[PDB]
């Protein structure tokens, strides 16, 4: 099996340097993800993704492509423990919040990190998420990571990676470790590469949005809201000009003569009514476009912010952009072959009608055995 | 770039969602099946679901499709142990991958990196083969997209990035204009001007009178009375509602989206079906699966991906299956094979 | 100038005592630079000639 010699040594030679514990995300990216959590549209979209992912239900189960008759559910008690932990991770945190934090950090930075506490026999004790901003990792000499540093100076735990850790005689680890699930990008560099996050390509629209809204706020208070710029002449005996002013003024709602005409005997005064449009202060047209851009870059049908579009948002960006990477990352190293983490699609409320109609239509067919009619719509056996 | 990245990761995500497996091929005329061991085939299944550690099959598909879209090339590396049993597969960074040609017509080795590490991985053409034909040592693929004037490998890349330089540059120019004009244009109204005979000192009084009608002022909302010395106000329009040039911007977006082959509507369900079985299926799925099938396994067996794993095609597959069920002048096996379902 | 978004007095009036200054706002249409109408026609032509 494992040959230990991958072709990613192209970068540790000179393009990188070993034993340095380089951080995983540039500080600029951290600040951008930080201030993007206060922006209206960006926060709305981010917690929309988080909520949608957080709603799905977990379980461990037999995998469909079980060619491995030598099933890797090493104990079938480790599998029960993994089920337990997938429903209840570390105390003071539930599985739902784990999913939410994981999906959120995946959307902001394109990374997912964790920590496990398998007791002594592959029985995982609890799982903790890792804060991507202040998580550093250290590389080997060949091509990959060995340890993760978490924090700057006082606490300095170099948690080992899953690659190097005291394994069981079957292959399962014996001590703690970490994951660092990563999203690919161009030019390979599996871990030495640059993050791949939507925040890369929305700096321009978010800055434009903030500029327009600042203009709107400033112009809201600062523009005089008065009408009737009335002006008399430089021959009016200032003292009956006050009388004319009181006459003009005392027609407000709830005045002495309210609603009646103004009569001016001699000395023509001249009124002009100010428009004070003030109906485009936020620049509605070049603002909804920035909103549409920073929404679509997150992969959210505009209509969300009809039911066909909800189905689309579910099985176009949530399913193959947060669900498959997370479940494949967990399945890759949390359990042996033949078993892996799965989530029930029929727990999604938007897909229920479609699943039912598909099931009925397949029921109508005959040139298909029952087991495949099942497996084409979930329902393993 | 906003639009280009959106489209690129859209393609990557869509391709990354499809499920692999090795299986009997339909056009199995080769009764001498090339699944040389049927244990190599199990190992290839294993690897197709779990490639090299610290990377899953889904991420392999994503990176492969992405690099195929950007450069029109796909490269890989295999580590078959000693008997055609592949150990792991690694993708190759196209930017810094160099290749060397033979004397007749084709590649022999791939150089990966500039100076320190210098592994000349052999091509699949020349490598220590098994007595059946399978290789024994490592090798690489370099799947290539064809173009005009042949030159199978000596040719120029064929990528959408060739024909979108103009629209992306125009888009960036318009957005830079918009940003610059957003901050820089005074956002004030009421350019009010008095005369050069006003005793500068009651001009300040007139200014305070005009000013103290803002929301939350002493006399807020009431009239302005000016006794003598007519002051003259003009209200500035400050349109500022076309700074990004909406019309000659959506066109550039449409162009750099359609050149990637994405129905505009995506950025209804009929259009999703179209995007699936018009540009994703015959532009990323067939080339990748034919490249893998060409040299990863013998004849009679090849890599296939289940179309019914695509969520957009399920209703169509079900309706087609029912309609075919209604026919009679067709045996059962062909009713199956016309809709997947091998045997 | 100091009424731009993020200035000292941002959004308030301009008061000029004497010496009337004269502002004119430029249109800067710039919304037909590509000539949308006599461009989609060329696109339609070189698409239909390919039979699409």
Residue numbers in the entry:
A (entry chain U): 16 to 320, 334 to 409
B (entry chain V): 54 to 320, 334 to 409
C (entry chain W): 264 to 315
Sentences from the study reporting this entry:
The 15-fold, 12-fold and 3-fold symmetrized maps of the neck were used to build atomic models of the collar, portal, and neck devoid of capsid (portal + neck 1 + neck 2 + tail terminator + collar), respectively. Namely, the dodecameric portal ring (12 × gp7), which is embedded into the capsid shell, connects sequentially to the dodecameric neck 1 ring (12 × gp14), hexameric neck 2 ring (6 × gp15) and hexameric tail terminator ring (6 × gp18). The structures of portal, neck 2, and tail terminator rings of Milano show considerable similarity to their counterparts in other bacteriophages at both protomer and oligomeric levels. The β-sandwich domains form a positively charged “bowl”, which houses a negatively charged portal clip domain region thus strengthening the connection between the portal and the neck tube. The lumen of portal, neck 1, and neck 2 possesses a positive electrostatic potential resulting in a positive charge of the neck lumen —suitable to hold and position the end of the negatively charged linear dsDNA until the genome release.
Caudovirales, the taxonomic order for the tailed double-stranded DNA bacteriophages, is characterized by the presence of a tail—a host cell attachment organelle that is connected to the genome-containing spherical or elongated capsid via a neck. We describe cryo-EM structures of the neck, the neck-capsid and neck-tail junctions, and capsid of the Agrobacterium phage Milano. The tail to capsid junction involves a symmetry mismatch that is bridged by the neck, and is therefore crucial for the assembly of tailed phage. The extensive network of disulfide bonds within and between neck, collar, capsid and tail provides an exceptional structural stability to Milano.
